[PDB]
Symmetry: C3
Subunit: 155 residues, 3 copies
């Protein structure tokens, strides 16, 4: 059993929607990023790479490499997962916590769990996603951006 | 073995004391919330629900439902725990990290561990609580609110 | 198997370099602290003490005690580890996430893993360190300080 932890942040910028956990969520503003800025999947990817001792998302897929521009975070998720499995690991379970004042993540979580479980080739029960606001405090409370944390357990 | 993670924040507002980890801690200002605003127990609850793949505190006990107004966070903690156990889980251990510039949590932690272990029906040794300031940085460093993180391991 | 979580923050102040994960990293400003302000090792220490139910770094090594002034965080790391092992624990694995806009931690991570694994008497593979910026948001995004999170799994 191996434990991992990931954390990510992306700033709001431009027009909506935003992509979180693979879900296109309607919002007044979008998120600024090289890729699709999916904070939830970056934090998850890092948690999994962390538990595998493979480093982090930026070590494997550089901000500098042009191909990663506009990149689908689920692709990165699946690749990191491919490499993790090849190192001999299997999924224990993952838990994600989206820290955002808005939009409301609640209704999109079921679909998120479907995408993530698909990507990790596991059952939805091994995947949990949740959300919380920082009750108007901070860059998140001010609507400046979204953050996300995640933990993973590999076997 | 299943892993979970929780995170919560509540803003200062009104008169003291504050309730953290179930402990009434004297402070110049109190915390604003629908319930008692116990940041430590919300973060813990989410960590446990997360490890169980039951979602989050707000999914089980809505901000909208009036009964939860003024609600004792230990009640929510015990209920979430009831449901978790019914899903077949048993406690491995939990670790909580209170992020607050003040007040000093240190002297109240023993009592916190007593309440939490009581609520989870475990031994104090399976429960750990700690604290840290953000050295004057951020909404926490500015005394605007308190945050808390927690991880849990279920069996 | 026992899980732990740690979190720490230190403000920039003075002249560089900074010490992170035991590595002297050149930077325009340094970090303000009683000790060497190694955010990465404090967060790690707490994660390990947390998994062991030993509390936190400040419980074991007080800000008030003068000896800890200028103190080498690896010393504290090794001591906390000594005490943890004496309580009967063995390392499962640790994962660290440095949240800093700058400097770039990437090139110093290998050396960090060497120091940490040395200190914990484990193999580098049981140690992972990663980094992330908060994309210009927050006290970290503003260059006001560095934060760090860590999780640990004890056996
Ligand atoms: N202080 C920092 C921050 C990030 N990094 C590295 O560079 C990348 C950070 O990029 P980022 O903070 O923009 O995160 P994303 O835009 O990939 O979501 C990370 O993936 C780390 O590998 C670093 O070495 N030092
Ligand atoms: N961006 C967000 C934030 C929270 N939520 C949900 O709604 C609740 C958040 O309420 P909250 O941030 O005020 O936390 P508490 O006041 O219950 O401590 C969470 O329990 C989540 O279920 C969400 O769907 N999307
Ligand atoms: N709100 C708080 C914050 C910290 N503390 C305790 O006092 C110490 C916090 O000191 P700190 O936030 O300056 O962290 P460091 O300077 O040791 O890195 C922690 O080690 C906790 O034991 C507390 O009791 N209540
Ligand atoms: Zn990202
Ligand atoms: Zn709360
Ligand atoms: Zn520190």
């Amino acid at each position: 059993m191996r434990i991992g932890h990931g954390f990510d942040v992306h700033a709001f910028g431009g027009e909506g929607p935003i992509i979180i956990g693979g879900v296109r969520i309607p919002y007044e503003k979008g998120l600024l990023a090289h890729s699709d800025g999916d904070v939830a999947l970056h934090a998850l990817t890092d948690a999994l790479l962390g538990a595998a001792a493979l480093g982090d998302i930026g070590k494997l897929f550089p901000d500098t490499d042009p191909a990663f521009k506009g990149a689908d975070s689920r692709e990165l998720l699946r690749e990191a997962w491919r490499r993790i499995q090849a190192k001999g690991y299997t999924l224990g379970n993952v838990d994600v916590t989206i820290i955002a004042q808005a939009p409301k993540m609640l209704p999109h979580i079921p679909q998120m769990r479907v995408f993530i479980a698909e990507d990790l080739g596991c059952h939805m029960d091994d995947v949990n996603v949740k959300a919380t606001t920082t009750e108007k405090l901070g860059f998140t409370g001010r609507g400046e951006g979204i953050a996300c944390e995640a933990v993973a357990l590999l076997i």
